[PDB]
Structure 1
Amino acid sequence: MKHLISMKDIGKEEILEILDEARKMEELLNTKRPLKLLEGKILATVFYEPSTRTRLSFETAMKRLGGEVITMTDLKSSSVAKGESLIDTIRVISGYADIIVLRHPSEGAARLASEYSQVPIINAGQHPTQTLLDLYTIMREIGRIDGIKIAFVGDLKYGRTVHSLVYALSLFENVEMYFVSPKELRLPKDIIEDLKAKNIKFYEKESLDDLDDDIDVLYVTRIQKERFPDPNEYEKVKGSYKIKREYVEGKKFIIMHPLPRVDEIDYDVDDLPQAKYFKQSFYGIPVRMAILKKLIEDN
C-alpha cells in the first residue's frame, strides 16, 4: 500500500489489518512511554482549505509516534492566488517530508497529487481515515463488526461520511442497517441499489420511534444549518431527529457522531454511558497512528 486516497481502494482485508495495527498503537499509548517508531520522520499537512480538527488529529498521531510535523495551510496568497500549481507544491513538499496528508476542494486533486508525489499521500477529503476511525470505534466498543444492528439518523442524502460507512460496512457479514431520516433526505437511490445487489437487509424508517431497543449502534450524521436555506426546514429536521436524554436512557446502543456537534445531540446526553462520540474522537489518534506507520514502512 502506497496511498490512502479512497475507501474503494481498500478491501475487507486491509481494513482488518489497519484496525488490528490500530489496536497495537492504542496499547502502546497506554504504556505512557515515549514511542519512537517514526523517530526520524516528517509529516507534512497540506491543507488548501483550513481544518484545525483534522490538522490536530494527524499532528498528534505523528508526534505520538515520535515524528515531526511541518504545516502549510493556504489556497490563498500562498500559491493559488500567486500562480503555483498543486503539482509544483506537491513536488516541493514531496522533497521535504516523508509523508503527506492532503486536503483539497477539487474532485481529483488527491489522485492527481499522488501521481507527482514521491511520497505517500493521505487524502483528508471521500474521507478514508474517518471511515476507518468509525469501524475501529464500533469494533472497540461493540466487540465485533459482523452481525450488528446499526441505525443512521439525519441527513443521509448529503451526508459525506455516511455513504462511505454504509459502503464499508456492506463488506461484512450480516449487518442490519436502519436508515432513519426525513423523506427529502433519504439515502441516495444508487446506494440503495448496491445494498440490494450485495443482498443486505435494510429498512427506511421515518421516525426515531420506529426503532426498537435491539439496535447496537446509533450513528447520528451532521445536520448543517447552512445546507438548509429555509429555516423552517432546519427547525423541522432538528426537532424531529435531535437525540435527547429521555430517548437514550436504558437503551443498548452506543451513540456515534463525527464531530462537531451543534444541535444533533443535547448536552445532557454526554454523561450517559452510551454516548461515545467523544471516545470515538479519541480513537482517531490510534488509527491515524496506524495508518501513518503502515504507509511509511510499506515504503
Structure 2
Amino acid sequence: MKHLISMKDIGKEEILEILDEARKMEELLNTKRPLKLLEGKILATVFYEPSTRTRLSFETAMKRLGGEVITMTDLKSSSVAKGESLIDTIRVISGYADIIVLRHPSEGAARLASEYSQVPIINAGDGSNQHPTQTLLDLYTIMREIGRIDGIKIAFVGDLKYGRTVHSLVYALSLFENVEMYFVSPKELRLPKDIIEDLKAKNIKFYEKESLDDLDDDIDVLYVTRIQKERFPDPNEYEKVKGSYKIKREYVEGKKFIIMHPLPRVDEIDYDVDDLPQAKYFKQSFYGIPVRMAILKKLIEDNEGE
C-alpha cells in the first residue's frame, strides 16, 4: 500500500491486517517506554480546511512512534496559500517530509495529490466523501469492544442521508460476514437509495427504523451520528427531531449495546449517559491513536524509500 485515499481501495483482508498492527501499537503504548519505530521520520499535516481534532490525533500518533511533525493548516487563507496550487504545495512538502496527511475541499484532492507526491498520502477526507483512517478506527472500536466484527447487530441513529462517516462504515461493514444493520432516522434523513441497493446486492440483512424504540436489546453497537440544523431550518422542526433521536440515560441503562460516536457530540447524547458502562465514544476516540500509529507505520514501511 503506497497511499490511503479511500476505504474502497482496501479489502477485508488488508483491513484486518491493519487492525492487527493497530492492536500491536496499542500494546506498545502500554509498555510506556519511548517508542522509536519512526524515529528519523517527519509527518506533514497539510490541512486546507482546518480540523484541530484530526491533526492532534495524527500528530500524537506520529510522535508516539518517535517521529517528528511539521504542520501547515489554514492553507485556505491567501496568507497561508498565496495563489499556489495544491499540486505545487504537495510537491514542495513531499520533498520536505516522509509522509503527508492531507485535508482538502475539492473532490480529486487526495487522489490527485497522491499522484504528485513522492511520499505516501493519508486522506483525512475531502471534508467528506472519504475518511479511511476514521472508518478504520471505528472498526477497531467494534473489534476491540465487541470482540468481533462478523455477525454483529449494529444500529445507526441520526442523519443517515448525509452522514459520510456512516456511509463509509456501512460500506466497510458490508465486507464482513452476517452483519445486521439498523438505520434509525427521521423520514427525511434516510440512508441513500443507492447505498441500500449496494446492501441488497451484498445480501445484507438490514432494517430502516423511524424510532429508537423500534430497536431491540440484541443490538451490539449503537453508532450515533450528528443531525445538524441545516437539515431543519425551522427551529420547531429541529427541536422535535433532536428530542426524538437524543440518546438519553433511561434508554441506555441495561442495554447490551455499546454507544459509539465519531465526535464531537453536542445534542446526540445526554451527558448523564457518559458514565454509563455502554458509553464507549471516548474509548473510540483513543483508539484513533493506535490505528493511526498503525497506518503511519505501515505506509512508511510498505514504501521503504531509504
1:79 Cα deviation (Å)? 6.6
> Cα deviation per residue 1:140-163 (whole Å; 9 max; x = unaligned)?
000000000100001100101000
Counterparts of 2:191 and 2:223 in 1: how far apart (Å)? 14
> What RMSD in Å do the two structures reach over aligned CA positions?
1.1
| CA separation of 1:294 and 1:81: change in aligned 2, threshold 3 A | closer
Please report the TM-score for the alignment, with normalisation by the length of structure 1: 0.98
Paired residue secondary structure (2:161): coil
Counterparts of 1:121 and 1:157 in 2: how far apart (Å)? 28
Counterparts of 2:161 and 2:248 in 1: how far apart (Å)? 23
CA contact (8 A) 1:79 1:85 kept: no
> Cα deviation per residue 1:262-286 (whole Å; 9 max; x = unaligned)?
0000000000010000000000000
1:80 Cα deviation (Å)? 7.6
Paired residue secondary structure (1:101): strand
> Cα deviation per residue 1:230-273 (whole Å; 9 max; x = unaligned)?
22231121110000000000010000001100000000000001
Paired residue secondary structure (1:165): helix
Please report the TM-score for the alignment, with normalisation by the length of structure 2: 0.96
| CA separation of 1:79 and 1:107: change in aligned 2, threshold 3 A | farther
| CA separation of 1:240 and 1:77: change in aligned 2, threshold 3 A | closer
CA contact (8 A) 2:217 2:255 kept: yes
- Unpaired runs of 5+ residues, structure 2, are none
Aligned match of 2:252: 248
Aligned match of 2:83: 83
Paired residue secondary structure (1:15): helix
> Cα deviation per residue 1:81-112 (whole Å; 9 max; x = unaligned)?
62110000000000000000000000111111
Counterparts of 1:9 and 1:219 in 2: how far apart (Å)? 23
> Cα deviation per residue 1:3-51 (whole Å; 9 max; x = unaligned)?
0000000001110000000000000001111000000000000000111
Paired residue secondary structure (2:188): helix
1:74 Cα deviation (Å)? 2.2
CA contact (8 A) 1:48 1:73 kept: yes
Paired residue secondary structure (2:102): strand
1:228 Cα deviation (Å)? 3.1
Greater shift after overlay, 279-288 or 120-129? Answer: 120-129
CA contact (8 A) 2:57 2:289 kept: yes
Counterparts of 1:132 and 1:258 in 2: how far apart (Å)? 12
Greater shift after overlay, 77-86 or 38-47? Answer: 77-86
Counterparts of 1:233 and 1:107 in 2: how far apart (Å)? 32
| CA separation of 1:145 and 1:41: change in aligned 2, threshold 3 A | same
- Unpaired runs of 5+ residues, structure 1, are none
1:296 Cα deviation (Å)? 0.1
1:229 Cα deviation (Å)? 2.0
Counterparts of 1:26 and 1:81 in 2: how far apart (Å)? 37
Counterparts of 1:28 and 1:253 in 2: how far apart (Å)? 28
1:227 Cα deviation (Å)? 3.8
Paired residue secondary structure (2:56): helix
| CA separation of 1:242 and 1:10: change in aligned 2, threshold 3 A | same
CA contact (8 A) 1:43 1:98 kept: yes
Greater shift after overlay, 225-234 or 25-34? Answer: 225-234
Counterparts of 2:238 and 2:88 in 1: how far apart (Å)? 43
Greater shift after overlay, 257-266 or 73-82? Answer: 73-82
1:78 Cα deviation (Å)? 4.8
1:232 aligns with 2:239: no
1:114 Cα deviation (Å)? 0.4
| CA separation of 1:150 and 1:59: change in aligned 2, threshold 3 A | same
Counterparts of 2:2 and 2:274 in 1: how far apart (Å)? 39
Paired residue secondary structure (1:79): helix
Paired residue secondary structure (1:80): helix
Counterparts of 2:216 and 2:134 in 1: how far apart (Å)? 27
Greater shift after overlay, 212-221 or 229-238? Answer: 229-238
1:190 Cα deviation (Å)? 0.4
Q: How many residues were matched structurally?
A: 299
Counterparts of 1:120 and 1:254 in 2: how far apart (Å)? 34
1:224 Cα deviation (Å)? 1.9
1:198 aligns with 2:240: no
Aligned match of 1:62: 62
CA contact (8 A) 2:49 2:76 kept: no
Counterparts of 1:16 and 1:227 in 2: how far apart (Å)? 36
Counterparts of 2:138 and 2:280 in 1: how far apart (Å)? 11
| CA separation of 1:270 and 1:77: change in aligned 2, threshold 3 A | closer
1:136 aligns with 2:167: no
Counterparts of 2:196 and 2:141 in 1: how far apart (Å)? 24
